[PDB]
Design a protein around this motif. Structure first.
Motif, mmCIF file in Angstrom:
data_model
loop_
_atom_site.group_PDB
_atom_site.id
_atom_site.type_symbol
_atom_site.label_atom_id
_atom_site.label_comp_id
_atom_site.label_asym_id
_atom_site.label_seq_id
_atom_site.Cartn_x
_atom_site.Cartn_y
_atom_site.Cartn_z
ATOM 1 N N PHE A 71 0.836 -1.190 0.000
ATOM 2 C CA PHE A 71 0.000 0.000 0.000
ATOM 3 C C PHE A 71 0.874 1.245 0.000
ATOM 4 O O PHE A 71 1.727 1.409 0.878
ATOM 5 N N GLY A 74 -2.595 4.644 -0.092
ATOM 6 C CA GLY A 74 -3.897 4.048 -0.290
ATOM 7 C C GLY A 74 -4.151 3.493 -1.673
ATOM 8 O O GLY A 74 -5.289 3.109 -1.968
ATOM 9 N N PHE A 76 -3.224 0.518 -4.353
ATOM 10 C CA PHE A 76 -2.614 -0.799 -4.403
ATOM 11 C C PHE A 76 -1.632 -0.868 -5.571
ATOM 12 O O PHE A 76 -1.801 -0.192 -6.587
ATOM 13 N N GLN A 77 -0.592 -1.684 -5.420
ATOM 14 C CA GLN A 77 0.502 -1.710 -6.380
ATOM 15 C C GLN A 77 0.684 -3.101 -6.977
ATOM 16 O O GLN A 77 -0.040 -4.043 -6.650
ATOM 17 N N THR A 104 2.484 0.806 3.533
ATOM 18 C CA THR A 104 2.059 -0.383 4.253
ATOM 19 C C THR A 104 2.352 -1.615 3.414
ATOM 20 O O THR A 104 1.970 -1.680 2.242
ATOM 21 N N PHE B 71 -11.028 -2.130 -5.030
ATOM 22 C CA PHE B 71 -10.510 -0.858 -4.549
ATOM 23 C C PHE B 71 -10.830 0.241 -5.549
ATOM 24 O O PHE B 71 -10.476 0.135 -6.728
ATOM 25 N N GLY B 74 -8.999 4.099 -3.149
ATOM 26 C CA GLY B 74 -8.540 3.722 -1.831
ATOM 27 C C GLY B 74 -9.626 3.392 -0.833
ATOM 28 O O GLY B 74 -9.308 3.123 0.331
ATOM 29 N N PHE C 71 -9.554 -0.600 7.750
ATOM 30 C CA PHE C 71 -9.298 0.498 6.829
ATOM 31 C C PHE C 71 -9.906 1.783 7.370
ATOM 32 O O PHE C 71 -11.101 1.827 7.677
ATOM 33 N N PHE C 76 -4.135 1.847 5.819
ATOM 34 C CA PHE C 76 -4.232 0.605 6.565
ATOM 35 C C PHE C 76 -3.751 0.824 7.996
ATOM 36 O O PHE C 76 -2.796 1.561 8.245
#
Lengths: 122, 122, 122, 122, 122, 122, 122, 122, 122
Positions: A71, A74, A76-77, A104, B71, B74, C71, C76
């Motif tokens: 993360f 916020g 996502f990767q 994160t 998602f 976020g 969340f 997170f």
């Protein structure tokens, strides 16, 4: 005319538990470990699931039994965007990410267990 | 006075590995596939965790073995808000979501395996 | 010179399925259940993944078989930051979180099943 | 007017003892003397009723005065399934019988004796 | 002063052979002739030691000259557990015995013979 | 010139009957009379072929007229493996034999009888 | 049942300075640039606010940001009575105005500036 | 150990224009609206910036955004000396002012406008 | 293949008011503060726009936010012709100006204010 053999059979009951344990780590981005489009974060700067700094190493993904989630702000990767090792974590294309940002990294490790009983009758 | 039978018993040891594999997809929102409060995204426009565009089809949730995470900007979403199909993905209530927004679809699939050994003594 | 016994052996095949059930709830932060750096959310105000408000209780983490994700504003959080019970959810260090903020609580519960067959030959 | 002969008679008492002697032999099956559905066991590999290996030859069934019994894995067999000779023992239909299996061959030989006494009076 | 008689004597030699003949019959248990804890086997379904099915009747125990042995699953049984007649065989307490089980019925019949010679001296 | 003697001859017919007597006893192995590789079973615990417990003693092998057969878990055994007495039965190397196993001891006793008739001619 | 979005808000502070600059010009009337009730004064004959003659041009009214004031013999005038150009100034109805009279042209120009800061919290 | 939030920041650019508007009204004093040291001029007798007579009302000072200048015979005056209303203008201490003298009333009204743009990066 | 960021934007509305404050002061020339071509006027002798003498100091031009106008006998003047300080006002080149002449000094001070609101959507 044919060979005679004893006939029996058995019955087996199996119970399985996943026993998940999930590791969570946190980092705040300072422009200290920052370079020409690359962000190598020392493994000593992460804060563990207790809100305390990790001591020696980060728990890697279980061999053939886990996966990673990352993360950044916020969003996502991908797996390709970063590499995770025991002694360090590094991410590329980090030129534009701002200071004090929240990063994160989520480690899901599963250690299933199973026990069974077998009954054979004659 | 009773029938006499042979008594034997066995022992079984079982090892189970979850063997997860997690599929990740990505999409930047353009106001192209946009309609009266509905966003139907062709399956061809997604990019995998390797940074490469998907070619033919998205891996659906494994039958009775998986789950979905969605998602948008976020903020986590409900299973009701979206439906996932092999050839397309569509979401309702998308009037307000802005241009170039990131949408991440997380597909968790588990393929457990287990092998066992049984020892029978007489 | 030695005791003579019957030699037999068996073979076992085991199939295991994780059977995941992922529970999702949702809440919008109003400055109603807000106090001196503490946020106790009634269990009656959450809405499930079906878009329907929950009635009696939150499905807690399965005993030794699950984990939690929390969340807040897309950032997170840590398991230390909050405690989850059946009839309530409470979180501390919530002085600065703004009104109407989205908060998402994720429950992963796994209930694996397995069946097996044993073949014994003489 | 007829020839006159002496009149005499006798009495006989007879005692008979069976004098059984039973030969027992044992063998553990290794996949060494194994072929296309035939098991020829050398006579040198058997162990006597004293727990010692036999030296020269197995005692065949006494002519006209005995019988054979064969045990394989505790299941009784036919006279047709096997042939017994002085220098060797061979059995057909042995494809499926497992390794280290117990084979017992039972030879019953009876050598009855009888002595008698006759008393004749005039 | 006394009556005078003729003194004579004899000698007898006797040879005895047991002349054993052993009858073996075989049966595989199908759940066809199966009832409330009773197993009545038709005499037509047995196969002799020659691997050939019996035709008309079972050779019963020789009158006052023989005995029976019964084998079920390799466990030896009592005379009480079963009754053997010319045209049928029936066994009680057979609720738990499994399908296709081997049953071996052993009939030992002995028909001894003896011939003798007598020599008389005058 | 030589002494003259009366010439006579006789004839003998003999009939023999084996009169077999087969005693059967049974026992279930409890880990009670069990020691360091030795199993001494009291003669009071055996049950006869009638399904009744034996009262005083086991009918031993007829002196010079009988033989023994021993069954443990359907595997035939050695003479040297066990010793049979009037009031005691003991077997060595019984460390590994399981509980509640069926033990069968077979006693074959033969008491032959024979009667004869003799006819003498003058 | 509805799309969930992140709530954020900002605060902006703005400071504005008018930053005025005022141009003053002077002229003494000679009966040289004088005609039939019209007075066209060359732009080279004016003297600046420093008491020095202007060199090339007079600063016109700023586009949509300024205004003009004209003084003749201490009496305020109309905007219609005169026109102002970069290279010249001309006034009508100048038949009666005497020699060596003072004419004052007042040009007010405003060039406001403003800088702002914005604070955004999550 | 502390709440984790998203860090974002913004930038604002603001442009401001004063956008002045100046109203000029003239009047020539006739000994008509003249009294015991007081001069009340009707709002109908003034002439605008275009040299045309005013019709309905003079534009008063913009609320909290303007100021007044008054000219009598080229001598500047105090705010106390006169009061300006929508439908009339009156001045005290006018016993000595001669006939046909010029009176100029200057109204400065400022209506600033400002537009801004805000850029927010993540 | 690229880092993913959250897209948000804002909107700003700004209102600006000039808030003018205009200070006026007045003086009548007596041949008291008169010298060799110089006229230094004590700041204690001016009278404000309320007809009241000033007490302590003259409100100077706002720093980078104002301008001056000077009136002598109804003829507008040069910036270079005079200098204005807090407690002193002096003018050169005043040999010929007559007694009891009117002097008007105009101070324009602008204190703009602006407030703004920012709306951010996600």
């Amino acid at each position: 005319t044919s060979l005679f053999k004893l006939v029996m059979s058995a019955t087996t009951s199996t119970t399985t538990d996943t026993n998940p344990e999930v590791e969570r780590y946190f980092y705040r981005l300072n422009p200290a470990q920052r370079t020409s489009g690359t962000l190598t974060i020392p493994s000593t700067s992460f804060t563990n699931s207790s809100g305390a700094a990790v001591t020696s190493n980060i728990v890697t993904a279980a061999t053939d039994n886990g996966y990673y989630l990352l993360f950044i702000n916020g969003a996502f990767q991908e797996t390709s965007l970063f590499t995770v090792a025991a002694s360090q974590v590094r991410i590329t294309q980090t030129s534009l990410v701002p200071t004090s940002a929240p990063i994160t990294l989520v480690v899901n490790n599963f250690a299933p267990t199973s026990t069974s009983t077998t009954t054979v009758r004659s």
